[PDB]
Amino acid sequence: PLVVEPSYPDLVINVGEVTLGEENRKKLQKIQRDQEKERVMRAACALLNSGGGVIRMAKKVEHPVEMGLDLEQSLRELIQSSDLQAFFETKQQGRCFYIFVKSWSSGPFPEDRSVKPRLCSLSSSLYRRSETSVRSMDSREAFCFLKTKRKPDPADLIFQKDYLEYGEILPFPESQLVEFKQFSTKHFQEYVKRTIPEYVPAFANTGGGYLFIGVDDKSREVLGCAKENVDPDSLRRKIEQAIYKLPCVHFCQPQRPITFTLKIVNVLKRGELYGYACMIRVNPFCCAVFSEAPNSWIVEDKYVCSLTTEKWVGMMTDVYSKKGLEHKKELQQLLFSVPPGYLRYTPESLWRDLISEHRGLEELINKQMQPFFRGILIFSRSWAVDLNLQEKPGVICDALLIAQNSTPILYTILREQDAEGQDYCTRTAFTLKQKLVNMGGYTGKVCVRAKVLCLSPVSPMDYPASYSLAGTQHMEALLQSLVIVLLGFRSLLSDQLGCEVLNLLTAQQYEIFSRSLRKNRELFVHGLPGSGKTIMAMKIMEKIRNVFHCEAHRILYVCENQPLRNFISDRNICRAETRKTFLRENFEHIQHIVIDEAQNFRTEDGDWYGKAKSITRRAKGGPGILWIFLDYFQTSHLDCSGLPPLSDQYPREELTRIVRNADPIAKYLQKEMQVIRSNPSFNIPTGCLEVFPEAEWSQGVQGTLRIKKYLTVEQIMTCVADTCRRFFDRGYSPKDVAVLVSTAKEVEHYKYELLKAMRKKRVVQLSDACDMLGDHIVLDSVRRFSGLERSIVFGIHPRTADPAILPNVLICLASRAKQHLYIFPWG
Amino acid sequence: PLVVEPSYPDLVINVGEVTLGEENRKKLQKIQRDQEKERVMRAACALLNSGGGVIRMAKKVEHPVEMGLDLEQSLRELIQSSDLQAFFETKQQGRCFYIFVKSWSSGPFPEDRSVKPRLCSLSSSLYRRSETSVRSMDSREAFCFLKTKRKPDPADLIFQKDYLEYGEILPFPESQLVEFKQFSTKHFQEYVKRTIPEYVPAFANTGGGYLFIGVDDKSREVLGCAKENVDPDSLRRKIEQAIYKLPCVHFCQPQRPITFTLKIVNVLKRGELYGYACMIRVNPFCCAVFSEAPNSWIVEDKYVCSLTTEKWVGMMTDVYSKKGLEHKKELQQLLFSVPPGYLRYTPESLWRDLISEHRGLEELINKQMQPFFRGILIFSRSWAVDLNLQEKPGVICDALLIAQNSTPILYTILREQDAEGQDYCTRTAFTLKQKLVNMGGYTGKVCVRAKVLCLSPVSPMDYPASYSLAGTQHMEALLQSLVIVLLGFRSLLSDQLGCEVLNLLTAQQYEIFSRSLRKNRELFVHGLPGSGKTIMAMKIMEKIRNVFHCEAHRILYVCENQPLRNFISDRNICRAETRKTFLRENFEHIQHIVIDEAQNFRTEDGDWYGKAKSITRRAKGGPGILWIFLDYFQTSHLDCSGLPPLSDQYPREELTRIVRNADPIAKYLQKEMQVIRSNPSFNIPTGCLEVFPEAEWSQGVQGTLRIKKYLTVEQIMTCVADTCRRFFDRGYSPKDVAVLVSTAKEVEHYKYELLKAMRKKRVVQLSDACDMLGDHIVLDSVRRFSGLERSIVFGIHPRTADPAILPNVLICLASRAKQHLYIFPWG
RNA sequence: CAGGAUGGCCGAGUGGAAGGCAAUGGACGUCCGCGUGGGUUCGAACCCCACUCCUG
Ligand SMILES: [Mg+2]
Ligand SMILES: [Mg+2]
Ligand SMILES: [Mg+2]
Ligand SMILES: [Mg+2]
Ligand SMILES: [Mn+2]
Ligand SMILES: [Mn+2]
Ligand SMILES: [Mn+2]
Ligand SMILES: [Zn+2]
Ligand SMILES: [Zn+2]
């Protein structure tokens, strides 16, 4: 049998001894020739349907030899084309002959989903009557036939006769609906039995027809078979069993079997029984009928296995990150931008960390990368863990090289020499290549070379020249498949890609939203948790600058919280102030005013609404912009905020799409918002919670949500320290983490309790939410973090004095976390 | 040669006598067998490429015979599929055998446009190297190859030598880049000429390569050709001529010839010159190389012609309305709705006119239409003129029947029996079928039977049963194709379809516009001429009723003109009133107000805007809708309208897409808006007229725009009467016509002068603009007609006492015409 | 899982149209033709593939 060589970074199938050369194969006997051909074609079909690979075969001669015309032709029928160079390339070295196979189709959603078939096959076993002949459907024909089937006469006069006369001329020829057969006196039953499988499916698949056995083909005379040599009852029984053995596949209800009418009719000669003639009328079958199981092969686990009929039909009719597939080009240009003229190392933080920890690693990698002048080298603590494989102790780092004039190379750097290091690297490279094809949807010729390196002081297969990354197009396509592969797993680069995906969704929704600047002056933007409200605000003020040509000091931003102002101020897109400062100072030169988290404002200090109206309505070029963003789900107090009554907040814009949180956190917010809807506070307007998110909107960005309870403060704090340590070891920056507590009066306690448990994890620097830019974990209260967001969030003991306010705290917390959220409730 | 028979409503090719039956064709000489096969395949390819048809061949025997396996296989190769039934159906009677051919590709923009080639071919004459062999590309392979070409070794060490030793075993086999050929023993130069086209194109098309002539294909020995047999220089000249004779096609510049290296090297035997060996190195060619002209055929006018190389490549690499194709389904359901269980006559106006003008026509049609229990019978004065053919005097009407269980039939009615009637009907039916396929994109099997009838006192081909319209699906598909066919011609049904296309475009724009209802209470809608402002107003009243659940009488519509008021009132979607009635009567019961044509309002009677604000913002269910539709290009007076300043008209919506006028009228409006902008009115703010129509927007609906200047008033009115008569004869109801004069005072003068001529055309009654729903022509002034539309508009002497309004009056006139506009300016 | 098919008839021919009952397939010395259609080869009745019918 055929099995995959286990020690390679690719699917390598060894088919054994094969006779190569046209003359040598001709000198063979037909049996040996066809058996070797079937072995090679099984290997080729399996590799085509399993992501490509290599076929290895030993050849009996030492000098170069051509493949052979029959092998050539079988490959041509396999790919349904004369372009062998596109899918098959051959090398030979001494006694070994290699065929390198490319994948037939790549990815879960190929561009050709409804155009080209899912599988290559040796045969589809689907037959249809093609005029006066029965023909087999190739892969394309069977694909179209199944696609059609899955969508939601004079012969009958003879058929009605009870008996036939010997020598009776039938008036019709063989045609699209009729077939004649005559068989020997000795082997009639066996011939009928071997006839059924080839004609009954052909009639069934194409519109039915009549099959007459006992009629001469040339003279159309009825002859039958002598009574002494046929038992009509046995013949009918065998015919029915024969028809019903046929594998039928359905796409409909009811799923009835193949329908037909069968008649064994006496043939009378001069008024006496000469013999019997068999007559079959086959109705049009509602679905596809196979004569036998399709001859298609696939590599699963480690064996070349044939696809069953149902599995074949399923593939032929029918995490995978759809947003990654959509944005692959933007994501690749953001993260894996291929440089001109120099080799890039990514991610830089992890690279610097590694070369600091391990002396001489810089020199090792630099001496190893001398050949490659242009490309990208992608580092990781362990690509095996990145790809959901097991971790191997002793691995310093793994690097993936994607450079010009070279194949992809996956390096494994070892602190000390090890024999199993090569096996680990080979497994990682095989997984990476199989994912780049099957999951990343790469359609070119790809191979990943596994090369182990050691810091302390079976040959690799040589692929054709076409497998080298010729230039920018190939490098960019491979990196765009790597993006899709990474977005299906959890890792540092996967999370960076998720962040950029969230940014792209925010950009799309802002492009939709920003068209309201020409259509409104007063606008009340009602956003939902994680709807990008603040990003939309900032981008709108940039747009106001661009459109009205007014300078930044002439645009005012007003918010409730000092951390949020401080964040907004550094952008330099405005003058940014707090509600109290706005009420106090003078802003008569301001033309445009933008107000954020208005639901958190208060009426005690003054009429901020009226002040904003007075300032804006005075603008020379007509009234200025006055946009008031707010979110009632994120209310933080039980008093009126000075906003106008609900009915008076017009015109409006609703930001209902969650674009700033990963899928787990988004679903968490959607679940929790029902809790607020079930019991809104008395001060909240009656009908302002009727806003609902877009029904089918999803982000397709992976994240982490975890709730741990019954734990003491020490246990919470050690768990936070451990998680931060793991993230930083993997390569996450500290500025991706923020610790949010219930109230400021607990912030000073938790800061000390956190330095206590984090001094054991080798980072002793924190800060409040007023110094976001610093590379350090932010510890602050949930409320003071309003309008801010961090990739990793640790929510500690949500708490408030009044249950009337308690419901909104959990949402106001979870909305701050982009990807990873850890909550520690009381228990 | 092959010629299309002229007396049929379809493409019929008579290929003469052909031997049919496998047993009969096996008795022929191969030469005759192949010639008959070539004739039939030429006919089939021409019909496939020309929209389908019938192949007529006389058969030499009386009894039914199968087509033959060689013919079947050639057809299978032709369509690249075993599904012959999809395209070819055969019927035979007596000594005649017919093959009915379906079109391969249909329509100007097929759905498979980039998936399948447009042409079927007998041979593409494109070859490529496949490892050791040269294969010809079929239609699909050549299509993909041309697409790829269009989108923007040790053998060298043998080629480097200047001589070879007889019997030398070359150290490499035949491969993708190497071919070995021996010299023929009889005609060496002719053999070389024969072989160069076989192998040079294959190398050139894919990667080039080496062709060794004089090398044993099996032993790889060098043999050459004896010096006494060939002249090396003559051989070189002939080879160069053969290579440069190869057809080539380019998708690039420079368009360079085939680049190759040719070496004639001495073959030495024991040191003495034995003969010559020929080596050609073929560099890869930038584009496609043919061995000869492609073997593709098409019907040109009435000759079955072959496509040239460049013409074939042009077809393979690549009025046709687009909106008709887009909306075919809805347009068909609107006009050509196929009813259940009865036969429908359309258009009913024309049907009634015909049966009133002609006695017994009702009996003729009804007695001819007895068999057809369901379908649609589409009437016209002359389908020939509808299809841009020449009219025939004596034709009463033409009816196109599309019924269940029947092929399409085109009926031609004559008053008196005529010999040319059958020819006229046949030509019309042939044109209609060719249009349904090549222009309407029908992909099924279609035939239009031509039948001639008369009031006063060549057999048709019997098509297969698959050409009958089996039910709703086929009837709908054919009628949807007829919609696209009609939309490309000027006719009554074409104009009706254009009207419905404009309605669908306006529905799309309203779907975009209507979501603003949830987001605004006060809104100013600034529409451009022909932007559908009034239609938006009506539909938004409907949506206000729907979404606020208030009774229709609670919604108020206020306009400036009594005709518009009435045209809105009769629809019961709201209460409609004038400004002069609004400012006086009691409207406290009103909740919501929609104001239209606000730019024409006046302040002399009161503060209409203040009253509207007061009524709306006091409403019992909170502040109600107050939307003010206005259009400054359509200003009718130079005074203040009472609208709030431009700076205060917010929130603001703009309707910039012209969706109410055909393409010529729209272009006229767009051009006149430039004059308006050049000289704006003084009573209008500076900024409003800076709203510009969508630059890239087009309607895709045909119409008439004609300016008839220097006419006198009597000539103007005679022309108007004549044009009205032509329209009414063609089938337009009079209520599609509006006659607009400069001002209301000249209404009576122009009306008297109108009747003075119109009473000669057998229509007497006219209608006022206050009775738009009448079945009579509307004569009124441009100002009084604002807000109303009709298909045909006659503009008489557009002028104003103060020329400052002259720019506005032309647009106020043109915007009223949906499809046909006739302007009669002053001398 | 295999095998046959040759000229009017019987039949010899497996890579440079016998014979037997003056010719004795055909198109225009070239080419087609040995069941039909293709392929390889300088060269096919002869080698390879598909198909037709029948036979083990
Ligand atoms: Mg014989
Ligand atoms: Mg023999
Ligand atoms: Mg033959
Ligand atoms: Mg020959
Ligand atoms: Mn048959
Ligand atoms: Mn048969
Ligand atoms: Mn060769
Ligand atoms: Zn079924
Ligand atoms: Zn070119």
Is the residue at B265 inside a domain? Answer: yes
Q: Does residue B357 sit in the same domain as residue B442?
A: yes
Q: Quote the DSSP letter at residue B418.
A: -
Which nucleotide shows the minimum CA-to-C1' distance to residue B185?
A: C42
Extract the tokens encoding A126. 């689907």
CA of A493 to nearest chain B CA: how many angstroms apart?
34
Nearest Cα of chain A lies from the Cα of B435 at a distance, in angstroms, of: 27
In a domain, B494, yes or no: yes
Do residue B813 and residue B709 come from a single domain? yes
**Same domain membership, residue B140 and residue B94:** no
CA B654 to chain centre: 32
Distance A65 CA to C12 C1' (A): 39
Give the 3-state secondary structure of residue A213: strand
Q: What are the strands of the beta sheet with B88-93, ordered from one edge?
A: B12-17, B53-58, B96-101, B88-93
**How far apart (Å, rounded) are the C-alpha atoms in residues B631 and B19?**
76
Please check whether residues B490 and B398 belong to one and the same domain: yes
On chain A, the residues whose CB falls within 8 A of the CB of B141 are 81-83
Question: Is B638 in CB contact (< 8 Å) with chain A?
Answer: no
Tokens of residue B114, six digits: 């980039």
Which nucleotide is closest to the Cα of A190 by its C1'? C56
Q: Which of A130, A172, A623 sits opposite B64 (nearest CB)?
A: A172
Same domain, B711 and B653: no
Beta carbons of B773 and B733 less than 8 angstroms apart = no
**Which residues fall within 8 angstroms of residue A224, CB to CB, at 6 or more apart?**
A164, A166, A214, A267, A274, A275, A276, A277
Residues B333 and B194 in one domain: no
Last residue of a domain, one of A289, A311, A339: A289
Structure tokens at B271: 């040191």
Terminal CA-CA length for chain B: 62
CB B248 within 8 A of CB B258: yes
Check residues 147 to 176 of chain A and report those whose beta carbon is under 7 Å from nucleic acid strand C: 174
Q: Provide long-range contacts, Cβ within 8 A and 24+ apart, for A35-40.
A: A37/A70, A37/A71, A37/A74, A38/A122, A39/A2, A39/A15, A40/A15, A40/A71, A40/A74, A40/A99
Which one from A26, A60, A116, A181 is the annotated catalytic residue?
A181
A646 in the same domain as A611? yes
Q: Inter-chain contact A128–B83, Cβ cutoff 8 Å?
A: yes
**Residue A654 CB lies within 7 Å of the nucleic strand C:** no
Beta strands of A42-159 (E only): which ranges? 53-58, 88-93, 96-101, 127-130, 133-136
CA atoms of A100 and A98, how far apart (whole Å): 6
Q: Determine the residue of chain B that is closest to A651 in CA distance.
A: B520
Which residue on chain B is closest to A525 by alpha carbon? B519
Residue with structure tokens 């996956």? A410
From chain A, the residues in CB contact with B67 under 8 A are 131-132
CA–CA distance, B145 with B201 (Å, rounded to integer): 14
Q: Min CA distance, B517 vs chain A (Å)? A: 10
Any atom of strand C under 7 A from CB of B348? no
Which residues of chain B are within 8 Å of residue A654 when distances are taken between CB atoms? 519
Q: Which residues of chain A neighbour B521 with C-beta distances below 8 Å?
A: 650-651
Question: B12 forms bridges with which residues in the sheet?
Answer: B54
B548 touches chain A (CB under 8 A): no
Distance from CA of B216 to the nearest CA of A (A): 13
Q: Are residues B247 and B341 in the same domain?
A: no
Residues 491-530 of A with CB under 8 A from B: 518-523
Which of chain A's residues have a Cβ under 8 Å away from the Cβ of B132?
22, 66-67, 69, 72
CATH of the domain at B799: 3.40.50.300
- Neighbouring C-beta atoms of residue B599, cutoff 10 Å: 23
Question: What is the Cα–Cα distance from A587 to A577, expressed in whole angstroms?
Answer: 11
Q: Please check whether residue B663 touches A, CB under 8 A.
A: no
Q: Per the structure, how many domains does chain B have?
A: 5
Query: With contact defined as beta carbons under 8 Å apart, do B596 and B557 qualify?
Result: yes
Return the residue in B74, B97, B131, B654 with the most chain A beta carbons within 10 A, the one to mutate for interface testing: B131
Distance CA B639, CA A245 (A): 91
Q: How far is the CA of A35 from the C1' of C55 (A)?
A: 26
Query: At A468, is the secondary structure helix, strand, or coil?
Result: coil
Whether B30 and B61 map to the same domain: the answer is: yes
CB contacts of B91 in chain A (<8 Å) are none
- Tell me if B116 is assigned to some domain: no
Per DSSP bridges, beta strands B248-249 and B288-289 are: antiparallel
Domain residue limits at A194: 127-289
Q: What's the sign of the alpha-carbon dihedral A27, A29, A31, A36?
A: negative
* Distance in angstroms (rounded) separating the CA atoms of residues B192 and B214: 11
Q: Do residue B64 and residue A173 have CB atoms under 8 angstroms apart?
A: yes
Q: Is residue A305 part of a domain?
A: no
What pairing do the DSSP bridges indicate for beta strands B592-595 and A303-306?
unpaired
Q: What is the resolution of this structure in A?
A: 3.0
CATH number at residue B238: 3.30.950
B134 touches strand C (CB under 7 A): yes
Kindly determine whether residue B176 and residue A131, on different chains, have CB atoms separated by under 8 Å.
Answer: no
Beta pairing, strands A737-741 & A652-655: unpaired
Assigned domain for A3 exists: no
C-alpha distances out from residue B91 to A156, B56, B463, B464, Å = 18, 10, 8, 7
**What technique solved it?**
cryo-EM
Using the beta-carbon criterion (under 8 Å), do B647 and A176 form an inter-chain contact? no
Kindly write down the DSSP assignment for every residue of B576-588, as one continuous string: EEEHHHHTTS--T
Q: State how far the Cα of B368 lies from the Cα of A372, in Å rounded to an integer.
A: 84
Tell if B27 CB is < 7 Å from nucleic strand C: no
Q: Beta strands A248-249 and A288-289: pairing type?
A: antiparallel
Interatomic CA–C1' length for residue A191 and nucleotide C21, angstroms? 40
Residue B57, C-beta contacts closer than 8 angstroms, at least 6 positions apart = B14, B15, B16, B17, B18, B20, B40, B96, B97, B98, B99
Distance A217 CA to ligand 6 centre (A): 6
Residue B140 DSSP SS3: helix
Find, among B425, B427, B413, B429, the residue nearest to B463 by Cα. Answer: B429
Residue B15, classed as helix, strand or coil, is strand
Calpha distance A721→A759 (Å, rounded): 9
Q: What is the largest CA-CA distance in chain A?
A: 123
Among this protein's residues, is A181 annotated catalytic? yes
Nearest-angstrom CA–CA distance, A457 and B68: 78
Same structural domain for residues A338 and A466?
yes
Is the CB of residue B415 inside 7 Å of nucleic acid strand C?
Answer: no
How deeply is B748 buried, as exposed, middle or buried, from its count of CB atoms within 10 A (0-12, 13-18, 19+)?
exposed
Alpha-carbon span A446 to B257, nearest angstrom: 35
Indicate whether A692 belongs to any domain.
no
Look at residue B760 and tell me if it is in a domain: yes
CA of B69 to the centre of ligand 9 (A): 41
DSSP 8-state class, residue B222: B
Beta carbon of A183 within 7 Å of strand C? yes
Catalytic residues of B: 181
HEC string of A475-495 equals HHHHHHHHHHHHCCCCCHHHH
**In the listed set A473, A490, A507, which residue is the last one of a domain according to the structure?**
A490
Contacts of A2 (CB under 8 A, 6+ apart): A13, A14, A15, A39, A42, A43, A46, A303, A304
Q: Is B152 on the interface with A (CB under 8 A)?
A: no
CA-nearest of A106, A115, A108 to A50 is A106
**Which nucleotide has its C1' atom closest to residue A33's CA?**
C48
3-state per-residue secondary structure call for A333-387: HHHCCCCCCCEEEECHHHHHHHHHHCCCHHHHHHHHCCCCCCEEEEEECCHHHHC
A155 and A220 part of one domain: yes
Domain boundary pick from B473, B501, B529: B501
Let me know whether A750 and A638 are in one domain: no
* Token code pair at residue A19: 């006779």
Nearest to B719 by CA among B824, B585, B581: B824
User: Distance of CA B389 to CAs B9, B424, B430, Å?
Assistant: 15, 10, 12
Structure-block tokens of residue B151: 């989108």
Strand arrangement of the beta sheet that strand A522-527 belongs to: A575-578, A555-559, A592-595, A626-630, A522-527, A652-655
Residue B509 lies in a domain: no
A66–B175 CB contact, under 8 Å:
yes
